[PDB]
Amino acid sequence: REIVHIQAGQCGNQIGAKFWEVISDEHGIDPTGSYHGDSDLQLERINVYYNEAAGNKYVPRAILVDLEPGTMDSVRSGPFGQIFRPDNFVFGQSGAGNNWAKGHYTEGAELVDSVLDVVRKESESCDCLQGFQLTHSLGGGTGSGMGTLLISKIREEYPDRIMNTFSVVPSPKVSDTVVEPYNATLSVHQLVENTDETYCIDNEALYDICFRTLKLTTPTYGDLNHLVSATMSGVTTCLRFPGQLNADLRKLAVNMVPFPRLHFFMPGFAPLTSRGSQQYRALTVPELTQQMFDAKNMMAACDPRHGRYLTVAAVFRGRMSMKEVDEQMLNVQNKNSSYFVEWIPNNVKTAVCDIPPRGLKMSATFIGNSTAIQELFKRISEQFTAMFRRKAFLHWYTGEGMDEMEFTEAESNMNDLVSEYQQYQDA
Amino acid sequence: IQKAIEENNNFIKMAKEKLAQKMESNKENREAHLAAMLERLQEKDKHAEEVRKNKELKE
Numbered sequence: 001r002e003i004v005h006i007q008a009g010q011c012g013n014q015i016g017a018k019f020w021e022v023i024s025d026e027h028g029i030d031p032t033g034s035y036h037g038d039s040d041l042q043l044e045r046i047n048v049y050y051n052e053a054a055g056n057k058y059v060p061r062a063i064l065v066d067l068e069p070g071t072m073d074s075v076r077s078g079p080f081g082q083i084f085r086p087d088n089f090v091f092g093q094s095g096a097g098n099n100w101a102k103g104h105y106t107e108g109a110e111l112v113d114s115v116l117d118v119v120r121k122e123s124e125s126c127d128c129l130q131g132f133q134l135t136h137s138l139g140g141g142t143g144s145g146m147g148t149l150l151i152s153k154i155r156e157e158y159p160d161r162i163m164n165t166f167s168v169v170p171s172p173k174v175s176d177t178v179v180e181p182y183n184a185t186l187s188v189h190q191l192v193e194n195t196d197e198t199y200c201i202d203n204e205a206l207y208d209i210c211f212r213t214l215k216l217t218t219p220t221y222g223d224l225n226h227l228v229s230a231t232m233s234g235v236t237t238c239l240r241f242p243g244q245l246n247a248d249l250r251k252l253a254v255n256m257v258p259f260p261r262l263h264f265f266m267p268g269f270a271p272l273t274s275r276g277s278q279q280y281r282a283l284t285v286p287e288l289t290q291q292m293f294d295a296k297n298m299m300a301a302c303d304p305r306h307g308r309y310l311t312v313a314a315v316f317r318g319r320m321s322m323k324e325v326d327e328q329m330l331n332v333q334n335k336n337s338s339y340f341v342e343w344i345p346n347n348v349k350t351a352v353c354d355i356p357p358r359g360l361k362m363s364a365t366f367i368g369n370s371t372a373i374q375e376l377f378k379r380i381s382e383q384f385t386a387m388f389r390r391k392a393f394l395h396w397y398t399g400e401g402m403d404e405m406e407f408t409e410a411e412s413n414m415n416d417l418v419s420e421y422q423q424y425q426d427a
Numbered sequence: 428i429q430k431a432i433e434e435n436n437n438f439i440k441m442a443k444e445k446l447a448q449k450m451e452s453n454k455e456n457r458e459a460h461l462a463a464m465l466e467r468l469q470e471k472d473k474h475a476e477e478v479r480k481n482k483e484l485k486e
């Protein structure tokens with residue numbers, strides 16, 4: 001059951017390359033695409049993400065997209081650049097100017113059909129494709145505007161395939177330009193319709209984590225992306241390694257998403273670790289469980305205690321007692337059952353994988369479908385309205401053909417989404 | 428995208444038209460300004476003809 005991976009834009013390609021770097025190591029694939037591991041467990045599901053080529057060489061089923069060449073040139077000269085199939089580098093030259101309109105309507109439109117040719121070519125070589133995944137930001141123009149155009153066109157050509165995303169939500173604390181609330185609001189509308197799972201990475205939670213917990217005084221985007229790739233590896237562990245039970249993306253989505261529009265998840269990771277800084281003391285199951293449920297370990301800057309969990313998935317990695325896991329997981333729910341909806345019975349599920357990640361004997365990944373995520377969308381809406389009530393910076397968009405009405409529309413849909421979350425918070 | 432093309436075209440168009448009538452109106456005004464100056468100098472010539480002429484009508 002193959003997955004096709006797509007990464008779009010500055011942020012999308014930088015976190016995306018880290019993903020392939022991290023899991024390529026987990027599967028014993030070197031920067032040449034050659035396997036040099038010890039176990040057979042790390043090749044049993046390798047077809048999920050890698051195509052097998054001549055010479056017993058493994059090639060990521062990855063398509064790399066940008067409207068400017070700078071970041072993708074840096075990928076090929078990068079730590080694992082050689083592994084990617086060179087025909088899958090699809091890029092323009094003009095850039096998107098941190099402008100959703102350019103990525104979605106004018107510059108991206110020019111380029112999108114070329115991208116879809118590669119998607120189709122990678123799909124037709126799939127025995128049974130089980131879905132697509134995208135990495136991208138919502139604050140820029142390529143990943144935000146063109147990424148959501150791709151998603152719309154993928155759903156047109158593959159309407160029954162699962163589509164999941166890691167979407168970096170913008171924040172003023174870690175910010176490139178002032179129009180990010182505009183691009184994020186326009187993108188969220190598209191995600192609400194055309195994705196099955198969206199893992200919301202709020203770039204300020206990554207910042208607070210890097211500063212307040214890893215004691216990094218001036219974190220870079222690189223430090224921020226180490227946390228993201230840890231989560232990306234964690235949430236895909238049970239598809240990449242033989243384990244307790246195997247569910248395809250559809251079955252996983254069915255049991256996590258009770259309502260089609262409420263598919264924006266809160267990811268988290270324990271233990272939280274910085275690059276290089278070596279961790280020597282392994283965590284106990286109680287420590288992993290407290291930390292992965294703690295607000296400080298969440299990567300969407302939302303207090304889980306301000307909402308209620310609709311569903312929760314937790315993925316523990318390493319050698320540990322699944323009995324101790326069961327008891328500790330059941331202890332968290334039974335101790336804070338007022339933050340779980342009583343009308344979805346047994347809505348906290350768990351999986352264990354014996355293969356730990358690089359550098360940790362033991363880790364846990366948290367996937368929370370909480371109504372508290374509305375706080376993230378309330379933040380974007382406030383920032384959106386603060387400029388939009390004065391029509392500020394809109395000339396960048398009206399000059400690409402957009403009307404004020406599309407912004408009003410985008411604003412209203414996200415205020416609906418916020419109110420939808422509030423309905424189930426009080427039920 | 429069609430609206431954006433239409434808007435880049437109308438701006439190019441109206442700029443071409445606004446400039447062309449400016450350069451014409453400026454051509455008209457400057458000519459009507461130099462001609463008026465010349466014609467005062469030519470009324471000047473007749474007058475001087477009438478002064479030399481009147482003096483001959485004096486003997």
Ligand SMILES: c1cc(CNc2cc3c(cn2)[nH]c2ccccc23)cc(Oc2ccc3c(c2)OCO3)c1
Binds near residue numbers: 016166197256315351
């Ligand atoms: C594929 C699978 C998943 C995991 N989805 C999931 C898991 C479980 C679940 C419901 N859903 N319920 C569970 C109960 C127990 C254990 C696990 C689950 C997420 C995903 O999203 C992305 C998007 C972009 C990326 C990316 C991953 O990696 C690099 O770029 C893609």
Ligand SMILES: Nc1nc2c(ncn2[C@@H]2O[C@H](COP(=O)(O)OP(=O)(O)O)[C@@H](O)[C@H]2O)c(=O)[nH]1
Binds near residue numbers: 009099171
């Ligand atoms: N985590 C992370 N976020 C990024 C990075 N680069 C840009 N961003 C975020 O994405 C937004 C800018 O979008 P951008 O990446 O330029 O979109 P693009 O035009 O598609 O490349 C800003 O709000 C940044 O916070 C990165 O390397 N890591």
Ligand SMILES: [Mg+2]
Binds near residue numbers: 098
């Ligand atoms: Mg940028």
